[model samples]
Target: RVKIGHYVLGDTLGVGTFGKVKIGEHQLTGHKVAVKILNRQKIRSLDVVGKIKREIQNLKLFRHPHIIKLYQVISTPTDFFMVMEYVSGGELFDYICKHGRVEEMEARRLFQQILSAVDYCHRHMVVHRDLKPENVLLDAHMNAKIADFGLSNMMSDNYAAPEVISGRLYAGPEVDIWSCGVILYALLCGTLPFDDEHVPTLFKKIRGGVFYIPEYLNRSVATLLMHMLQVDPLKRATIKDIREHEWFKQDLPSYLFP
Candidate 1:
């Protein structure tokens, strides 16, 4: 074990441009965690110091069952180390790849957890600008845990509201609802609703809200997706609207609500 501050580091979990994530264990408590090690110099050079600070702030502020937990942050002159909850089931990206889209019942269960977390964040005035399978993790039991706030900006062409994509300012919550629509489509189909090998075409489809729902899916489910994927942000469904949808209220485990 390699010692870094009060934690002993294990194998590398993943790597990114700034640095890598490693498995870590607290020296005194023997608690396992994931430590994100980042090069402070690289961050400063890229002029993303503010973004990093915002990510940390969001993590610290978020405390929910379906959101990844941030335990602590440690910094050195050259690097920043973030200790976070260790989720072992891996990314939802891999899960979908392995299963080639989940069944409607299972998808409903997972999406409910995701929406619950998202609603909590919105209530706190925080918008997760980037909501995709890759940004969601699963615990050992496969519960969803939303992760990564690096791109939690007000907008992104791929997932932003139509108004935001059109270069008009938009509400943060509306932007998030659009992303939720995209995520739901992918979860149900194992493919993105709006996607193209060409970036421009992708943007066009997103702005136009051009996508087809498989006829095999339940009409109720398709209706919910339509409300979510509305081209006009003003016509898009709010989280409250989603929660009240007949499909959403169907067959949900009682424990999930209370």
Candidate 2:
């Protein structure tokens, strides 16, 4: 009975802080998507209208293949229904947890997509301060589709750059490179490089910016990881540097270049 544009809403996928996410199908072509319904009153009371607005703006501006697509937004008087790409393969976090580390070639393919999305964002002057496996979704084809970009509340030091953990100012792109380093580690190792029961210790580890690599990983990738995880943001590898790395340059798609 409920419809938004040319699509009809279906059963609930799940409920989020903003509101419900329902499966929607196009009436004509039978295409599917996830539609997030945000209540005006809930957002106004939660005082997070700014983040929602920023997410909307940033998601709309992006058109990269690896980044999640926002198909449409229907803003009624009481709600904002956001129609987004329906990714069926689930989260990268769950994939890592279930599979216990991806093989090198597969990891390289996924990391390439992740880097391509992040590089595209940097060129657009948007920094995804909240990058992590949880925020990266996989399509039915098992391709990375980055979701949930916008500002953060200065949280989670595990994937944070040294500057962020040490309370120093951070240049956006450099910090993102640091996070990508952490993600790469997790993809290959099936665990985070910086993990501790005590957050203070975690903070210390992050500020130090040193991560361990198992012997199984080839030196080529380990070397790239070192440059990416460097404590000094000034010395850290940029996307350009990564593109030139012997390890990263392998099997990378031509169209992924910015």
Candidate 3:
């Protein structure tokens, strides 16, 4: 069994919708790890067992440098524990919220890393349906790691399947690209590009082609962003296409994996 401190209850790190996360220490080497304790009863009642299993299977198969590593799964009578890579650096949203919007160069560098990770996932037949600042984690060195693949799916072979995942509305793989565009826009602009109190209004705005660049944004950055957030799925660029675009080309050496 993994041990943390003198008492194994360990100190709580944080809590999520269903359970608490704690910092645990390994028994042999005393190394620290982030332990996520989830309630089995709650998960079963919610009928998310298949979702959790899908995430575990995807994590096991798609091993990218920018993706969080799922160390192990420990099942107990009442709870399920997930041992994950401990990134002491904290949340990406906290950092962005505190610092406001970052410079274009810095944003580009970090964004390139995000794109690389997404491209890796897409290449492996996975689509990270939910991509947001809150889901993108940072490490000690500020390296970006895309986390929370609960909504992800292995779609390389089944691209033709209709998009019916339930939420506010039904969405497809393009939703991932759209969310990615939103993240990029958020990083470059302090405010969210689109704001609508109602779900229907939000969908209308998303489908109505109503994106714009504020006066403060650089022309090149603004232009590229407009392209990424394009309303038409056919015109929207894919992860592979975005990587080869001119905006990403400026700093190719720093962005590309060696």
Candidate 4:
């Protein structure tokens, strides 16, 4: 067993710019967990340091069922280790890629869980600036668990709202709503609504709110997506509005609420 303090490290689960995540288990309790190892030397600059600290703080504050749980954090001058809940089902993006586009009911079920988590974060004043499928993880039971808060700022380029892309500061909640629209479109269509090889072209299309929903999609769901993808952030649907929409009200699972 590879030992790191009280936990034994297993195979590498994934890697990113920050560092690598490895499967780990508690030596005493035999409980499985994910250990994120961040190299402090690689994370130079006070700005990045502050962002990491904020991520830790945000994880500490969140306790929702649909959000990943942080068990503990250990640190030294060279590295920072975070032990989090080990979600075994892998990334939502991989699941979607395997199935192409998911059916309307299944997509709606996952979307509902996403909405619940986002609403909880908004209520607690924590905004997930990046809300793509890559950042969403699934448990063994297929429950969506939102992950990664490294880019939880007010603005971002990729999944950003119109105002953010236009260089205007926007409200956090509205920005997240726009990303939810993009994610919903991707889930239903098996492709991004706004995509281009060139960054400038992609930004222009996103700013202009230019996207097409196929005729095969449910009209009510399409309408909801339209409202969420509004060019004007002021006109975009709020979480409350989305939750109350007829499309979202149809036969939602009771477990999502509890």
Candidate 5:
């Protein structure tokens, strides 16, 4: 029975290493939100102080349909309560894995939303740094809401750009575009383009930037994927370029135009 401000938290959603996430509802309006409560004493690390604190600076100001709205932070002597918009549907990766490749229009819709979010971030001079299926969440309507699409990523990686993989260091928007390419591949193919059992071979394949595009994919989309997956950062297709592509423009939402 935790009560904070206008909302009452109930039913533990999850208890992670140092915090608990609870489902909360606004008592008067019945509005729903997920609340993450952290013990101040338990986490005295760079993560809580440096990462999350700075993370909120941008999140609080960001207003987008495809982005999660981090509402407010309530700090008590011992607790840190974070309230954000609630989406009952979970990770897009979970859904994608369960279904094994979403269809064409569906992929286009999801991908368009994903690109819109990324584009918005870029326009704000912020870079997602890491863009993948695992980082994207699906709402109750199964609409894509890009989560953890922040600059720091609490410091992590996996879907590496060739510049990073080949030891040239990483570039900003270009690297994210590369990762988005990987995500799109996962969306349409239900498999990774550069997946390999061995690390050395994986790096080689990534550096080569060559992938098998199954014929099941339309020629239009296959061409677009080629541009996005370009190994050379200098040559990679950008958010601007991606929007104009024939494959990306199909049945695009009107809100996205503005």
Candidate 6:
């Protein structure tokens, strides 16, 4: 076990329910990184140690530029620390909140990168059970990186599809699509489709055809978002379909990905 002050803990990058993430400078290499220290007591109380360990293993397996990079894990007497690559810019939500919203062209490009990385994870049978704007990170170049695989799960042929897993309400992949739709909607219209206070109400609204179609969206973008947010997972748009959509293929910025 290494001492708490073994590395210089610089600026605090972020904080979560588990613990805090700080920008740390390596003593030997002089490299800057984000170190996430998980509170052991919290982990034990929440029974999330195994899940976090599994998440670390999955991160080790998934190697993609669009996915956050995980370095080594260090165990201390009171906590477990996960060293990750430092994303200089910060969370995507902050950018959205700062700019009020992003351009549709930029959203399309970022969404494409997200979808491509998600497709890779899906092909490997891993489902990111929690995907919200807060869970997505941005680098210095404003490129997207899928963060927080803690809630991710591996689906097998025999795995039963649960109606609720993350407790945010709605069904499985359908719920994820709902979130994706919300993200796209926010990106385009600068607001969410539904506005419910309670989880049950939110799920009820989701089941009862609750979102809105903004007047400003182009026909194709509106069409794609609607299809992606379908209540039925089977009817939801796939990553391949999203990539082939006119918005991603033609309307987005050319410098999005090189």
Q: What clash count does candidate 1 reach?
A: 0
> What C-alpha lDDT values do all the predictions have?
0.78, 0.82, 0.67, 0.79, 0.78, 0.67
Model 4 deviation from native, Cα RMSD in Å: 4.5
What does candidate 5's lDDT look like per residue over 1-258, in tens digits?
778776799866556665677878889998888887877777775255555566667778889999878889888888788888776676776677677898878888888888888888777635344555566888889888976422222222325888877777577788888888888888898888898888898989998988999989988999899999898887899887888898887788879759
Candidate number with the higher TM-score (1 or 3)? 1
Poorest stretch of ten by lDDT in candidate 4: 149-158
Answer with 5 or 6, whichever has the higher TM-score. 5
Q: Residue by residue across 149-224, what tens digits does model 3's lDDT show?
A: 2211212220111122223353445666766787788778766677677856655666665866778877777767
Off-target runs (Cα >4 Å) in candidate 2 are 11-16, 26-30, 48-51, 125-129, 149-159
Which of the numbered candidates is closest to the native, going by highest TM-score? 2
Cα deviation at 21, candidate 5, in Å, is 3.5
What is candidate 4's lDDT per residue for 1-258, written digit by digit as tens? 657666799877777777778888778988788888888888774348778888798778778888888988988788888888888887776677676988888888889999888887777745455455577878989988887622222122235678887787677778888888877887788888888899888989988887888988978999999899998877899988997899898888766555
**Quality of model 6 by C-alpha lDDT:** 0.67
Per-candidate TM-score against the hidden true structure = 0.83, 0.86, 0.78, 0.84, 0.85, 0.77
- lDDT string for model 1 (1-258, tens) is 567666789867667666678888777897778888889888888888887788788778877888878888987798888888887777776677677998888888898998887877766635355455566778888899876522222122244557777887677777778888877887889887887899888889888887888877889999999999898877999987998899999876655445
Give the runs in model 4 whose Cα sits over 4 Å from its true position.
26-31, 44-47, 125-132, 149-159, 197-200, 253-258
State the RMSD for candidate 5.
Answer: 4.2
Total residue pair clashes for candidate 4 = 0
Best prediction by lDDT: 2
Candidate 5, 233: how far from true, in Å? 0.2
lDDT of 5 at 4: 72
> Which is the winner by TM-score between candidate 1 and candidate 2?
2
* Models ranked on TM-score: 2, 5, 4, 1, 3, 6
Error of 1 at 67 (Å): 0.6
